[PDB]
From a paper:
We produced amyloid fibrils from recombinant, full-length human E196K PrPC (residues 23 to 231) overexpressed in Escherichia coli, by incubating the purified protein in 20 mM tris-HCl buffer (pH 7.4) containing 2 M guanidine hydrochloride and shaking at 37°C for 7 to 9 hours. The 3D map showed two protofibrils in the E196K fibril intertwined into a left-handed helix, with a half-helical pitch of 126.4 nm, which is remarkably longer than that of the wild-type fibril. The subunits in each E196K protofibril stack along the fibril axis with a helical rise of 4.82 Å and twist of −0.68°, and the subunits in two protofibrils stack along the fibril axis with a helical rise of 2.41 Å. The E196K fibril core features a compact fold containing a long β strand (β1) and four short β strands (β2 to β5). In contrast, the E196K fibril core contains a long β sheet (β1), four short β sheets (β2-β5), a long interface comprising residues 194 to 208, and one disulfide bond between Cys179 in β1 and Cys214 in β5, with a higher β sheet content (77%) than in the wild-type fibril core (55%). Four pairs of amino acids (Lys194 and Glu207; Lys196 and Glu200; Glu200 and Lys196; and Glu207 and Lys194) from opposing subunits of the E196K fibril formed four strong intermolecular salt bridges, with a distance of 3.1, 3.4, 3.4, and 3.0 Å, respectively, and Glu207 and Arg208 from the same subunit of the E196K fibril formed two weak salt bridges, with a distance of 6.3 Å, to stabilize the mixed hydrophilic and hydrophobic protofibril interface. Lys185 and Asp202 from the same subunit of the E196K fibril formed two strong salt bridges, and His187 and Asp202 from the adjacent subunit of the E196K fibril formed two salt bridges to stabilize the two hydrophilic cavities. In this case, the charge-flipping mutation of Glu to Lys at position 196 disrupts key interactions in the wild-type fibril structure and induces a rearrangement of its core.
Prion diseases are infectious, fatal neurodegenerative diseases primarily caused by the conformational conversion of prion protein (PrP) from its cellular form (PrPC) into a protease-resistant, aggregated form (PrPSc) in humans, cattle, sheep, and cervid species (1–12). Forty-two different mutations in the PrP gene (PRNP) were identified to cause a variety of genetic prion diseases, including genetic Creutzfeldt-Jakob disease (CJD), Gerstmann-Sträussler-Scheinker disease, and fatal familial insomnia. Most of the mutations do not cause large conformational changes in PrPC, whose structure features a folded C-terminal globular domain containing three α helices and two very short antiparallel β sheets accompanied by a largely disordered N-terminal tail. Here, we report the cryo–electron microscopy structure of an amyloid fibril formed by full-length human PrP with E196K mutation, a genetic Creutzfeldt-Jakob disease–related mutation.
Residue numbers in the entry:
A (entry chain E), B (entry chain F), C (entry chain D), D (entry chain C), E (entry chain B), F (entry chain A): 175 to 217
The structure:
């Protein structure tokens, strides 16, 4: 009944901004309303 | 009944902006309303 | 009934900004309304 | 050399919003970079 | 050399908002970088 | 060399907000960098 579960995620980044009136600059983003996340289930 | 589950995701990036009145610049983004994510299930 | 659960995430970043009236600059962000997260379940 | 200068501007409005994740709703707006406005000149 | 200068501006408004995550709602707004405004000049 | 200078501006408003995470709601606003405003000049 053996399972296994692995996940790697390296996220390198470098932002820069010089605004003159308006700027938002939202980097990597998510949103999940009724999220139900799981992993390695053996019901 | 053996399973296995692997997933890697490296995400290198470098943004830059010099606005003069309006700018948004949203990098890698997602959204999932009623998300139900799983992995390595053996019901 | 053996399981296993691993996940690594290194997140290097370096932001900089010199505004002249408005700027937001929100780096990596998420939001999950009715989140129910789990890991390595063997019900 | 008589002049005259009149200008009226009534601006009635009524906004409303019920957001669920993003909304801007900028009402009557302007912007003028090197503006040089005058009135009733008799050089 | 007579001049005259008049200007009226009544601005009635009524905003309302019920946000659920993000909202800006900027009402009547302006911006003028190197503005030089005058009135009733007789150089 | 007679001049005259008049300007009236009544500004009635009524805002209201019930936020659930973020909200800005900036009412009538301006900004003028190198502003040089005058009135009724007879150089």
């Amino acid at each position: 009944f053996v399972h296994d579960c692995v996940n790697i995620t390296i996220k390198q980044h470098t932002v820069t901004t010089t605004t003159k009136g308006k700027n938002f600059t939202e980097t990597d983003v998510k949103m999940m309303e009724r999220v139900v996340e799981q992993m390695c289930i053996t019901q």
